[PDB]
Subunit: 442 residues, 4 copies
Amino acid sequence: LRSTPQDELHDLLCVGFGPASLAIAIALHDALDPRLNKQPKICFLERQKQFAWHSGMLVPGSKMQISFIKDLATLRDPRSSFTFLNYLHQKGRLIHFTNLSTFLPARLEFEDYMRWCAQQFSDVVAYGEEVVEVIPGKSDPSSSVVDFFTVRSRNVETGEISARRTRKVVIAIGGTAKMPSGLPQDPRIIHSSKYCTTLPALLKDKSKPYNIAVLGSGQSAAEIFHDLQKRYPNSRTTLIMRDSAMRPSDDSPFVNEIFNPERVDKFYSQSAAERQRSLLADKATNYSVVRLELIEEIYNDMYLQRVKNPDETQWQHRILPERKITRVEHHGPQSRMRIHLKSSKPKETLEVDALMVATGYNRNAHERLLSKVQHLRPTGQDQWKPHRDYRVEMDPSKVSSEAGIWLQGCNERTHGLSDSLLSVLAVRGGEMVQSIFGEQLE
Amino acid sequence: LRSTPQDELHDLLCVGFGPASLAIAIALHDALDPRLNKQPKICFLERQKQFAWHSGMLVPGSKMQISFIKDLATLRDPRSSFTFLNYLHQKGRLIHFTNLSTFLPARLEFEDYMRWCAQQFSDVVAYGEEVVEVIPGKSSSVVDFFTVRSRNVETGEISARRTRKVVIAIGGTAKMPSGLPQDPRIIHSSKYCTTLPALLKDKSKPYNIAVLGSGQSAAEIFHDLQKRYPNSRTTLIMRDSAMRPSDDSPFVNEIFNPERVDKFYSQSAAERQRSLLADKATNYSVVRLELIEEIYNDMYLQRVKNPDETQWQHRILPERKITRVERMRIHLKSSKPKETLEVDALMVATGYNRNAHERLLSKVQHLRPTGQDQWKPHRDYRVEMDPSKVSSEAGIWLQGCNERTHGLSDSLLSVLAVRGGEMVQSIFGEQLE
Amino acid sequence: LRSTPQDELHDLLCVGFGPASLAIAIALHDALDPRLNQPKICFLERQKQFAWHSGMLVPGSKMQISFIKDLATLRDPRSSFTFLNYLHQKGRLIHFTNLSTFLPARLEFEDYMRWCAQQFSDVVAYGEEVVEVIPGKSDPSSSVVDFFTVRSRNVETGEISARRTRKVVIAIGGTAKMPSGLPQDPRIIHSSKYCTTLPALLKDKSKPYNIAVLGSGQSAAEIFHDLQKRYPNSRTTLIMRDSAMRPSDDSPFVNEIFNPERVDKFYSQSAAERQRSLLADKATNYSVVRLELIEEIYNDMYLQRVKNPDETQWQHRILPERKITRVEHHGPQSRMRIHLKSSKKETLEVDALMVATGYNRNAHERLLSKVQHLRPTGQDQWKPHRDYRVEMDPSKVSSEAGIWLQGCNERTHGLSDSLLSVLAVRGGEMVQSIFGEQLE
Amino acid sequence: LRSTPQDELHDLLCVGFGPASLAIAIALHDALDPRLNKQPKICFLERQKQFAWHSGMLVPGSKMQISFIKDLATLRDPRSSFTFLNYLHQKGRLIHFTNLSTFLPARLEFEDYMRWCAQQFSDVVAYGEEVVEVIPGKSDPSSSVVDFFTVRSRNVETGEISARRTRKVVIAIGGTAKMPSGLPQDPRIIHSSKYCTTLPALLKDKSKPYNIAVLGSGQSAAEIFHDLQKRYPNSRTTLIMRDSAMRPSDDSPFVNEIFNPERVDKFYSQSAAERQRSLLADKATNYSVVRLELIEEIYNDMYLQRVKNPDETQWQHRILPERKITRVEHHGPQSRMRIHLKSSKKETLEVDALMVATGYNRNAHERLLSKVQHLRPTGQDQWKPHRDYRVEMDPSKVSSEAGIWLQGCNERTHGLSDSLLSVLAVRGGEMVQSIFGEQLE
Ligand SMILES: Cc1cc2c(cc1C)N(C[C@H](O)[C@H](O)[C@H](O)COP(=O)(O)OP(=O)(O)OC[C@H]1O[C@@H](n3cnc4c(N)ncnc43)[C@H](O)[C@@H]1O)c1[nH]c(=O)[nH]c(=O)c1N2
Ligand SMILES: Cc1cc2c(cc1C)N(C[C@H](O)[C@H](O)[C@H](O)COP(=O)(O)OP(=O)(O)OC[C@H]1O[C@@H](n3cnc4c(N)ncnc43)[C@H](O)[C@@H]1O)c1[nH]c(=O)[nH]c(=O)c1N2
Ligand SMILES: Cc1cc2c(cc1C)N(C[C@H](O)[C@H](O)[C@H](O)COP(=O)(O)OP(=O)(O)OC[C@H]1O[C@@H](n3cnc4c(N)ncnc43)[C@H](O)[C@@H]1O)c1[nH]c(=O)[nH]c(=O)c1N2
Ligand SMILES: Cc1cc2c(cc1C)N(C[C@H](O)[C@H](O)[C@H](O)COP(=O)(O)OP(=O)(O)OC[C@H]1O[C@@H](n3cnc4c(N)ncnc43)[C@H](O)[C@@H]1O)c1[nH]c(=O)[nH]c(=O)c1N2
Ligand SMILES: NCCC[C@H](N)C(=O)O
Ligand SMILES: NCCC[C@H](N)C(=O)O
Ligand SMILES: NCCC[C@H](N)C(=O)O
């Protein structure tokens, strides 16, 4: 994809360059390849200084939780140059991965696969750009009708505010860390999204006997609890969960069909109540769950401590189920905080050097980013309403049919449990290219 | 165990000789064995003509869903002669089972294990006897024994036995949808292997057979039908969108540990009810993952041959409910808050109710304390009796129907070895000291 | 690929259209595709349509090789002839993803190869059984051989036809191997003819036939296991010389001998090291069974032990360390009498004996008999170079003419030679060696 | 079992208190329990200061490679108190092990079970006792036939020599470390049997970037190669194997029937040629093989290194196949040795240690029995045990009330299960009937 001058009127601007935007960029490339099919002025803005995929949780040994066939191209076109298999071949690694007999690459490897993808679009991506607002624009003096948008971004290095004009906008900014409201702010209280990048700076000495607590019972909580035991081999770690136990993620094959690309149509057209009941019944596919293999390795590690000492209170690493944090003392010059625990049903204290908080994410950042254009929604809406093709509803007497804003990655409530994942990314990128660029390339 | 003359006043009579009563019999044997602990008058009444474990569902290839370590003795005393490993050694099969490298024996094999246990108690078990009522007795207004009346299934004659203590261990009764009519071609899962072959005699005919439900039994029946009638057209009808996997992940699975019954029983009703609901995936409306996948590959091969799933020989109809049954004509609607199948048979795999003891005890429920509409079992499974109406040497115990008070392990094999031990100490404890 | 008129001088004629030749046609197609980067080519195939070992497409049989080792992906994952691309064209890619397996059903993997093969219909002549490769000399003044005449028998009409080509590839797989001393009888059927021939012999699926199976490898286990479902009342007997079925090896360090990049290193080794290396890796391919199938068969036997502790009474039995000493097959009797002795006093009466004893890969020697005098003086076997071209006497054969062997070269090229393992990459090298300079 | 006074004439003296002898003592207990069936003078001598099972190879995370049902009692009688399942019950862990859902306990745990068994026989076991010779004895001067043996043991603490008299002797001494001949003696060259016990004493600082080499391709080499990478996370380890690859151990179910106890009869009665051919064809069940799960993990580790750098030669931890050591230079002050390698059809490594995982020889019984070697029948140069493991003696030189039995060193005559735990439970039973059968009847 060729770059467009920054001051020119773009056909599309995407906010964020994570996998969701990357799959749009790939799909456009493939849609423009005569070899694969029957140029738009595009750019991408990403706040990070270079492409990176959840680097705070690139835990040593952590694995993907989705078949590599669900990559950024293969489900739309296995012939694409951006398949995961073509990447291995380009690296001289395909025969070697074949002998792994796994559908589950290491997270480190799949991120390098996406880095290999992203770097081929570097001419159309501006890194170190934090988008802060979308502002309406009207190109014609005669009309009060909005027919473009001005996107404003702050450069993370200079702080300078730059402005770009585009006819259409995509918001693909993933999630922001979700914290329990009652925890106080403190350098020693670190969300899972920043585990690998900040906790080593906080606890520099790998051999010191730190007390480190982990809050949560889902995949990130189990991976952090397990990694800590290897990363700090002399530590005393504690897993604090509201649930009675870690529970297994569900990717049994019939259940897993809710993630098929062709289900988005059927999910979207069902009623709101039916959608919420469906999301709840399938909660075990994605939320507050741990891969069984990790459950079993952690259970075996607990069992070995039981062999060595039958008294669980003396174990080096413990799990405290059905617990909730009632108070955290974080004042004073001392190394450690005092966490107060009660049962999580409708006394005990831990002194810890750090509390890792694995409570997931919110996906509501588009509301702050779009506030200066929310007066363009149809009358009476307090939320953005994406259509099946992901374009939000605008008042048609206020917005031209040539302008629009699309949302990506935050539509689980309307489009299904695959919306925030990689599951439908290859196909969605294709649908998006037809939606945003169809008539232009036709 | 030696027999007691039928006309004598027993120390204990157990109603039903399924695994729960068998473990009680085994625990008593071990309690009386000097090798294991350095005789009470007992007897068992069983409706079936001989020992059998869910004979309607011994489908070919069906496996146990619980480790063989959870047999009728091992968790209580690994040295017992009634362990599953001791049974295999007695059969000359222990080295061969070792090499299977499985904790989950065939259900056919596990039934044989318990049959082998049961035959060692043949002298105290009366088979072909349907208990029909438990009546109070007064040896005064204080009740100090119970008269248990049973109908012989062969003669129909009503026999009567007197006992100081009674155990009700009668498992469950088939739970049916209220809207199904009575017809020989509508069969609960409990009678699948024993009744459907007599109905569908010719294995090669193109029968249409429907299977109702989405749990382990529905999947086993659905899958077995395709092998048993290879030209049939089968349909699995589920209210749910998919079969879901059973959970025995190791931390979740500790709720079935024997020492958790103490903590579970002492929790409040609300905590017990919420605990049961969150752990529902361990036992209800769930299928062993291996079977889900096996069935999925079978669907996949049909997809290879025909991309149109509506033309497939064997189908799954998710999110459906039966609205009427009129070959029978099944009418289906969506199960969310006009389809028809014509079927030669309807298999109904909807589980069980365990409330059959209430009718069996109806004539003694006036001995409960004032204001009770249900039997209230204590931790040791003894039901509360009015202390001014029933002597303390008399009482009634419930087994297998106490999930609400004692946890999800109550109707399963999980805690039987240990529970038998508690039951023998509960019921015969002071007698043996 | 466009067809070449039959009477014209071809650049390449391949004998056989199985997977080995199929990887060649796909490779040449891709070499000519501008997205990824015409010779006069034709393929002759004895079968009337494309088919891959149809006698052993037993129900539930699975591949023993990763779908990644299909006919294109290791050479170019972008090719249109990949297995993942096949699934996508059939609208089945998402459903296969949820299978979570690298091992498709053999029935499915054959449909993928048929789907590929159908795109070359214009350059494949089916129903043509090649019978000889004859020398040709274009110049009456020269004694030099510079083209070859391939004669093929029409399987329907019996008519013989001749096609001329400068270069020949022999890609004809293997021939059924039978133990000498078994006699010929319609009730004695090699594994290669199981699905196509046994139903014609034993028509009644419910009759209590006695059926014996000879061998201890993958096909023997699959036939033994399939018979029990196909004839549910039968008595089956698996007769093995070995003491037990042994598991096939695709553990990851060992499995690298099948890497495409091992063909160079293996080939450059001496005969002794090559003969020794093949021997040490026998468990990857010969007289071995998929562990999962071993475990299933074992579970079936254990259940019979639950039902009856006397092994002699079992419906289905395995007889280890046995050899067949004699077969009585004349007489009006439906059944044969197989006489057994230990292989270090048994008779079986059987309605059929299935023989799962593998293949020989020497059939090209008869097909090349009329050109073997072009070999260098003193050779008794065709000597394939690294690029699979056989050594010819350079004073007898022009440098523009040659013959290549495919699939029969394990002795020089390693255990992957007769499998699907290196076909994608080998198809590509073959196109470079045969057509490289032409496409310059 | 009740102890017998040291100076008295014993019925049985066992050299060694490892698993083979432990199953015999357990079997004798169970034979004497009226609870299990319808006391002989016994004592056990063990060189180690207390019971231990290959503690040099109790690698963290190491698993058993045999189902727990093949413990020290269960195949002979599941009702014994010495079963693995009963041990868990005594330790209050049975339900917790059940939820593990594995037939393969940790090596750490299974050793603890045998320690739990062994401690119940502490009264008949003399630890720290190295038996050095067995000496013929004649109770009647005028008769020329031997009817007892004197077993002499050296105390590892004091050096004091102790002699004990017995009518029957069992030799159950496991193996001695087998080293390749061309390797020299050096403290930085340590056999695998001494890994956990010696290597940390050599390489004290776990964080320095040591070069450590491992020689071999079987289970022990892979276990040590994998463990070094976690134990010394900054080290560079090298696995050197003569074979081209690590190969999976075979315990598939039909092949695995060779370890069934009832097969010992059929195997023993085969001719030497058939037995030698049988051992070779089933070699992948026990020799130069690694548990598949470990192979796959080591392979995943190599693959991740390939992800980080495609050039193998720059990798931290490497595997060098089809290699042989042609020379080791180890003289001088330089901390590292120089290993010289050639293909096994000029490469050199500087190493701080060479771990040698080359298995064992089981011929130590010949030196120990040298002073009784003249009692064998004429023309034998090796001890030949009968099916019941009793060695052949000249019947004119030794009374029938006396004899010597071998345990664990009889693979050649009794099958691949002989050196393992596979038949210990049943064999212990046969041994008590052979040695004490008439005595208890
Ligand atoms: C540790 C961990 C592990 C997994 C997963 C999450 C996490 C945290 N996921 C789910 C995950 O959401 C998914 O893998 C993708 O990251 C979805 O990509 P998105 O593009 O929607 O956003 P994502 O968070 O990937 O990327 C969003 C981008 O937007 C940028 N951005 C934010 N604000 C901006 C602004 N104001 N201006 C410009 N740019 C901005 C961010 O920097 C980021 O680069 C997953 N899914 C799956 O299918 N399989 C799996 O195995 C996993 N595993
Ligand atoms: C098909 C199937 C498969 C499984 C299971 C159930 C079913 C239906 N279960 C759970 C099952 O309930 C449990 O294994 C035991 O059978 C419970 O034993 P009870 O004897 O308490 O009931 P159960 O039904 O076993 O026994 C009750 C007995 O009383 C008799 N009876 C009833 N009424 C009577 C009367 N009025 N008079 C005299 N006798 C009477 C009955 O005939 C029966 O023999 C299971 N659990 C587990 O832990 N692991 C597993 O894998 C499975 N698998
Ligand atoms: C039951 C079974 C199962 C498997 C396998 C074989 C068998 C029999 N194979 C091994 C097999 O060799 C391989 O898969 C490929 O078929 C190799 O194909 P070839 O083209 O080399 O010849 P192959 O035998 O496939 O086909 C050669 C073709 O040549 C044609 N032909 C022969 N002689 C002729 C003549 N005289 N005139 C004209 N045409 C002629 C034949 O008709 C045939 O179609 C396998 N491999 C693998 O990599 N993974 C696996 O899981 C398996 N599984
Ligand atoms: C690291 C490792 C791991 C395993 C195994 C071996 C090794 C090295 N084995 C095989 C192993 O040989 C077997 O488990 C038992 O050790 C066999 O016991 P032995 O009694 O033959 O003695 P073993 O070799 O156990 O012990 C012999 C004893 O004799 C003593 N002794 C020696 N000489 C003496 C003397 N001169 N005087 C006094 N005492 C003396 C020694 O001190 C020692 O205690 C195994 N098997 C299996 O079935 N499953 C498995 O998973 C494994 N795993
Ligand atoms: N959390 C990851 C879920 C991935 C999903 N099961 C899929 O197969 O697409
Ligand atoms: N017969 C199967 C050979 C496949 C080979 N192990 C491979 O991985 O290429
Ligand atoms: N090397 C350990 C051998 C274990 C053996 N396969 C058995 O089943 O006894």
